[PDB]
């Protein structure tokens, strides 16, 4: 699919993951 910039969909649980 992609890997540039990467999926955004994956940064909705890259955030709570880290700000947990």
Not at 1 to 20: C, F, H, P, Q, R
Request: hydrophobic share 40%; aromatic share 0%; no cysteine.
């Amino acid at each position: 699919s992609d890997k540039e910039v990467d999926e955004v969909d994956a940064a909705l649980s890259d955030l709570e993951i880290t700000l947990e």
